[model samples]
Target: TNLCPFGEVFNATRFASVYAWNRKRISNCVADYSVLYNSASFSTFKCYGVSPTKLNDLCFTNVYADSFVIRGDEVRQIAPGQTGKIADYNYKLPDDFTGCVIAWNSNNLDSKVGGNYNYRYRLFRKSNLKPFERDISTEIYQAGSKPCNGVEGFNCYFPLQSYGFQPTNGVGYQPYRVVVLSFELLHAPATVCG
Candidate 1:
């Protein structure tokens, strides 16, 4: 529950970016997004904790999301856990909207060979070719794992590479590894102009 920073009402037409890190090569993991809002903010957010483990068993978790104005009207759907050549994917949005939010849930684990093969994500502007934010979890090496830390029932890792709203102005697209999961994007209603 409320494991990460909870609140931040985003302005209309802005973006909400999310990233998660898990070390185990197994599915059944979740990035709890209980505290996010369309236009509200929260405080006292803490990433889950972790303890040292063998190279194969080392794992962690870290997540961050912030709002940003979009330069274009379309929301591009970039493939998750990408490695090799990066491709462009897009979806349409409505005019009575302010911005969009992206969140993901995965049932597939990283590949057999561990490295940066774990689930990774970032957000970028299509017009200016800039990165909104970036975060990644590492797949060290291990098997027979569960949600290592205090996280119960669901499997997850401790906070490792946590990043927040860092405007890169125009950080080019980043590509690496591919993990399959469910990605959800919410269009924030344009109630007020930003």
Candidate 2:
């Protein structure tokens, strides 16, 4: 029954709704918010994996944060805390896809206290036949931010830098989960929670 840190986000359970094709405004930069890191995998026919030619539409999804994208071996800047879907310059996705690996910022997850300035990211998924696959979820790892100390006006929470959805060797023709998403930790707080 825990909420997100600082009461920034509610309903941690339904943070991200999959399989509906309803786009969302993932991030906003008006205020400094904490975020988490996570990753997932979808079939090639569903969510295409990252590539030099087709990477713009699937790389960055960090909340109110910045992430990196590689183009022609050169790293590029992408604003994730804004409103828009990942878009590529020239590549195109096929029609009638069935799956997608979505990496989201889980500000309010299982253990969130709803009053701290902490941040986090988590993964969720949905198949072509159902809204989601319960057992197919993976937990996000801890990144840049760290736990806070009992001080005033100091932040010790670590922020995640990136996420991914790599391919695996066990599966059927449902296409390998190949989508890869990346993130960048904007800041590392030096003070602990008071």
Candidate 3:
């Protein structure tokens, strides 16, 4: 796995203001991350997809992870998925983590339910706050209960892999930067599992 983000989407509007702390929540189902992969974005949190205009829908292999563990000085991959390492908020990312996503469940709302006793997520269009920018040429990836390391219920969904990527780092230098990406958010899944 060369382990680079697929076509990482960007959002100049990641925040309400340059000095603001409020993150733009595209929908109740989508996570509070500026960068993400479609498969992981939708499948990681919900049990079904919620499309405002078309809700024909989905299910999952297994709830990949409930949340991540932050300890020591660095953030670790989602617990139970990674090698069981402890994560701390103040440490640097592992140098070899080129293919890894910044698995930080910053808001920790994986299981947050609404007042109506139901959990749902809606994909926001241009009518919402702002639309995230992504490469239209890249084909969106998704899931239908794909297998996850043979885990009883868990499955896998990768981001749009390397399509329409131009390698801004250019030719010679092996440059690395922390970039924020966005999810297309076709829909969201509701949670009701054992």
Candidate 4:
């Protein structure tokens, strides 16, 4: 829930400079975020899971928000289950925030082709980039599918949730502050739906 290091495998690394806007991709299936949550301004965005208790209670439950923006559009939706890119740009981060991760959670299960493409919580920033002396960089969240959800005549789409720039890794980066927390369809059926 709250960035639990309980039994997670840690391949930790240092928070280095953004290397040429590393672009990542997804494929096979897509995620549709338009139906899961509402839209809000960045300034209105608040930190989720401030404490371990809150992380377990709050973050775990609502970790399904599907939208957010960093300095610019670091991440964007190109095609469903195809591939998307997360760009790096100049922006600012909060002082106490720690690390953050990106996830691709999908439900387009295809046993033959491959299991449904669903991912959430892939590492974006393992270290909170706030305390650095350099200018802040932008961080954005993404979700959605071009087609609408399943309907008689409507097209079915995938679902994706996002969370960026939070206090996660401790010691060097303490007092983590998470800007966004998302839950993808890749999660248990009841966790995000039902």
| Model 2 misplaced regions, further than 4 Å | 1-11, 15-22, 27-100, 103-194
Task: Give one digit per residue, the lDDT tens place, for model 4 in 144-166.
Answer: 35443343233332222333333
Better of 1 and 3 by lDDT: 1
lDDT values of the candidates? 0.25, 0.23, 0.23, 0.25
Candidate 3 local lDDT, 45-119, one digit each (tens): 211123222222322221221111221122223221232211211112232321222332222222222311121
> Can you rank all candidates by TM-score, best first?
1, 4, 3, 2
Better candidate by lDDT, 2 or 4: 4
TM-score of each: 0.19, 0.17, 0.17, 0.19
User: Can you tell me which runs of candidate 1 are displaced by over 4 Å?
Assistant: 1-4, 9-60, 77-194
Where does candidate 2 have its weakest 10-residue lDDT segment? 68-77
C-alpha lDDT of residue 44 in model 4 = 26
Residue 76 Cα positional deviation in candidate 4, in Å, after optimal superposition: 29
Q: Report each candidate's C-alpha RMSD, comma-separated, in the order given.
A: 20.5, 21.4, 22.7, 19.9
Candidate 3, residue 166: the lDDT equals: 24
